[PDB]
Design a protein around this ligand. Structure first.
Ligand SMILES: CCCCCCCCCCCCCCCCCC(=O)OC[C@H](COP(=O)(O)OCCN)OC(=O)CCCCCCCCCCCCCCCCC
Lengths: 96, 48, 48, 48
């Protein structure tokens, strides 16, 4: 895992980290799968284009890659709105 | 406006709602036609 | 046919126990716990 | 989920078979309490 620093921002009214991308995996998709781990391995080369896109157009909002395995890798990183077990409201978001 | 588009009349059954089961919310877009955002003549239809 | 007296006994014993339980238990098992303000019956994992 | 490598993570259970009232449970690979893996266990299962 990665623990980010999460400065606060305008143009996103939330705490956002321009260092890396965040990854969303649907709640009922085990990460740890061989499909999922082979995905987080090659999608790791996206963060440099995410960073370059944002460096050339500082007025950019979310940039996302939605995978056909259920993953969503977005930039900039930012904690999700709903965690499945943190509170009591299960998040039902699937990119597909 | 930033609110969802409403369809029909909203009615729920309050005697069949567990307190802690996390209702689903929404996935629809805010699709508001042009003739439902203003008052509609015959000229606005042909402009549209 | 030798079982004509055991049948006549099981019958009149089931009748007596039905009449006794009809007197001590009639109408006592109609309350249960629901969630407050709902018609959902509130049980546990493998409770009935 | 059919094999043990798959039966990992969380999953949804629906209360009273209602798709709009779900809750999260961890999924786990469970063994039956009475099984036939060795002869002592099979003898116990057949005793019951
Ligand atoms: C051909 C061979 C000849 C040799 C024969 C010897 C005589 C045998 C006569 C006894 C009859 C035994 C039949 C009972 C079925 C066997 C039950 C058994 O084996 O269970 C083993 C049990 C394993 O269960 P498992 O699910 O694997 O547990 C996992 C977590 N521990 O793990 C256990 O701990 C179970 C403990 C078993 C306790 C058995 C006690 C029985 C005592 C009987 C006395 C009462 C009978 C009196 C007379 C009856 C009528 C005449």
């Amino acid at each position: 895992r990665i623990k980010p620093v999460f400065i606060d921002d305008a143009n996103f009214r939330r705490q956002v980290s321009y260092q890396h991308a965040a990854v969303h995996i649907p709640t009922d998709i085990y990460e740890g799968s061989t499909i999922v781990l082979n995905e987080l391995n090659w999608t790791s080369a996206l963060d440099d284009v995410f960073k370059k896109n944002r460096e050339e157009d500082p007025s950019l909002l979310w940039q996302v890659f939605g995978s056909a395995t259920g993953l969503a890798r977005y930039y900039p990183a930012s904690p999700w709105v709903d965690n499945s077990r943190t509170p009591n409201k299960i998040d039902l978001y699937d990119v597909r | 406006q930033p609110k969802p588009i409403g369809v029909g009349i909203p009615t729920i059954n309050l005697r069949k709602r567990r307190p802690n089961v996390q209702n689903p919310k929404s996935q629809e877009p805010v699709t508001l036609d042009f003739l439902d955002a203003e008052l509609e003549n015959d000229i606005k239809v042909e402009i549209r | 046919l030798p079982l004509f007296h055991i049948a006549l006994l099981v019958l009149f014993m089931v009748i007596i126990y039905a009449i006794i339980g009809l007197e001590l238990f009639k109408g006592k098992m109609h309350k249960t716990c629901y969630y407050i303000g709902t018609d959902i019956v509130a049980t546990v994992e493998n409770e009935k | 989920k059919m094999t043990e490598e798959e039966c990992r993570g969380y999953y949804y259970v629906y209360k009273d078979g209602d798709p709009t009232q779900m809750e999260l449970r961890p999924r786990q690979w469970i063994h039956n309490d009475f099984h036939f893996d060795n002869v002592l266990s099979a003898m116990m299962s057949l005793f019951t």
